[PDB]
Structures are given as C-alpha cells and as structure tokens.
Design a protein around this nucleic acid. Sequence first.
DNA 1: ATGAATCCATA
DNA 2: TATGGATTCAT
Lengths: 203, 196
Amino acid sequence: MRIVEVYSHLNGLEYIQVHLPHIWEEIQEIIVSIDAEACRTKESKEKTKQGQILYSPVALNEAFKEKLEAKGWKESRTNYYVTADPKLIRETLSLEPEEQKKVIEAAGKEALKSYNQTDFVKDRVAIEVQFGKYSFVAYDLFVKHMAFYVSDKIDVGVEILPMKELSKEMSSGISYYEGELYNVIRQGRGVPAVPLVLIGIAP
Amino acid sequence: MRIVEVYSHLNGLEYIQVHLPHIWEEIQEIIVSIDAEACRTKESKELYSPVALNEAFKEKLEAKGWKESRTNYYVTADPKLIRETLSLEPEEQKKVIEAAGKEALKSYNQTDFVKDRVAIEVQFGKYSFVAYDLFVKHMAFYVSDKIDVGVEILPMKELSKEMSSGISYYEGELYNVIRQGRGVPAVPLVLIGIAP
DNA sequence: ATGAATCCATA
DNA sequence: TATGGATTCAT
C-alpha cells in the first residue's frame, strides 16, 4: 500500500527518527508490503452499493496483524484504578496500579480497576490500525495512547488510517485520515499531550 | 433518577449558572423526573436498557424544547489550511481550501439535544462513544460557535454494572478527561453521573 | 449476549 | 452525501 499523508503531532515523528529510527523504517516497510488488492473481497449488501466488491476491513486488519507480529510487535496492557474524586485522580494518575488502589481506598473512596490494551507495541511505541467507526479513533487518540503514555509505557503513538480515497471504496460510515486529522487539529496546539504520528494510507 | 456526581470542566457549570440558570434547573428536573424502573429489561449478563433510558430522556428533553442540531465544516489533508479555516463558516472553508488547490471534503457533526447554546449528550453506549462526544462532537459545535458549554449525562458505575456489558461509566470517563491534563478539551463541560 | 462489522434513516 | 447510531453478524 502507499503512504499518502503523514502528520507529526508534537513532533512525534522527529522523536522516533532520532531515538527509534528503525521503527520508522519498519512502519513504512510494513505498509509498503501490504497488498490491498488481496483484501478487496467484501461484497457490499448496502442498497447504495449493492454488489460492489469493496476492501475488507477484516482482511486489511489481518494483513497488518500478520506483518506487525512478524516484526515482533506484541500485545500490551496497562492497568489503573479510577474513582469519582477528581483530586484523588490527579494524585494517583502517575502512580503504579497497586499504589493507586492503596491511596484511593486509604481515603475511604472506592477504587475501580480498569485498563487499556493494544495489539501492537514495540520499543515503547504503540501502533493502532483503524478501518471502522469514527468513535474508535477518538478513543484510540485521547484514551488508549494517552493511557500508555501517562503510565510510562510508550513515548509516541501511531495511528494508521485510510485516506478518503480508500474509505470511499469500503462500507459507508468509516473514519478517514482527513476527517481525523481535522479532529486533532481542532483541539488546538498541544492536544492531546501524547506525541503522535498520524498516517493516511491508500491502495 | 438521581444525580450522584457532577464535574464542572473549565467552570462550565458556573458559566451556565450565571448566563443560563434556567438550563441547569431544567436539566436537574428532567433527570429527577425519569423513572429508571420503567426502563428495565429481561436479559442476562455474563437490568436496565440503554435504548429505554435513551428514549426516556429523549421524550423529556424534546418536550422541553431541546432539538437536534448540525454543524457543517470542510476537512482537508493540509494542516496549515485546517488551522486557517477552523473558525470560518462552511462555504468559506470550502472556498479557501479549494483556492489553495487542495481537495475540500464535506463533513459535519450532529447531536440530538441543543438549546440556548448548550448541547446535551445523553450517553448509555459502548466504551468509545463518550470520548467521541467530548473530544469531537462537543468540540465541533463549540469551535463553530454554536454552543458555549457541553453537557454529558452518564451512568455511575453502580448503574452500568446493572446494564449490558461494555457501557462506559462516570468514574471512568471523568478519569479519561482529567488524564488529559488541566484545560483539555477546550470546550467547557458539565459531566453528570446518574443512578436509578 | 458480546464486540465487531456494516447497513441505512435523516438532515 | 456523510455522519450517528441501528441493525446484523461472527464468536
């Protein structure tokens, strides 16, 4: 596949190029190695596209998974305890799971265990590949990548998305690069706090 | 139903209390007037129905004048052009983007309840919906100058545990916001956690 | 009886 | 026509 657009948020791309140059080389290689044609096997049942053979998100997801795990990218999970008290939250935000619980419960407040898990993490870099609803991209950017960043698990996050040129060749209602880039820029300079590299791809 | 927790983000609640006091009174009244018992369902988990709770609020809100709204905007691949057209109106964004020789893509956000420049998102859905509501939907109306403060109604954990799996809860979403750091997102908000 | 995948009711 | 959320579909 082709890398059409790349956006470096908080200079996350430069950080990788300086500290983890092999990671950037590897990500580009993985994308270039994906044969989008072999993933064009989803026969649409939508009335507005009845019969068209579209790119399959399932096939695309499998293709990336195969290449990433083959390069040593592995699943990672980060745990943390949440609570209703804003102050206790700010206090335990950067502490270890065990201490977060201890601190919250020590104040007589209920500690609720939660977490975030992602399939592709390597050398303190997390990659998310998304071919689905708009809401999941917001969740990835402002919650998942952030959770791993705050818990000191990754230094930069990466989000791979289909350009509009590709999303229009998939089932309707799928998030695309241009739209998600806009959602991030709309936040204003410096938000979110986690450095990121947004990548828009096409066949 | 009852309000268990309230979080004023960027003093959004105070903003409403000063400029639109009738809105805060109305929001409280509506929550109190909803009977969670009439929103129960016969289904087991590994209960209260999200659809029923949603319809309950929808009825009350629309009866009080809350109506759906939509904000349009043109997106594009060039970051510089985005920052230049963020605050402009739809047709003007298109104009500016296409004049720079770039492709302009029509998009928008739509929400069910808006009134007196306030948006209320009732949310009894899957885990990714609140993040989208806060960082995308509310921000879109705020940046397009359609609302001054956003409101998010969510179930407390004690209610979500009595609902189908995967439903986000107040304590967790509050955490997601505060984890961003002070002042983020940029739109003033009032997060409200409820229980039966 | 969940999480995805994916269809489609409106503005 | 694109989004938001409804509905359908593999576990």
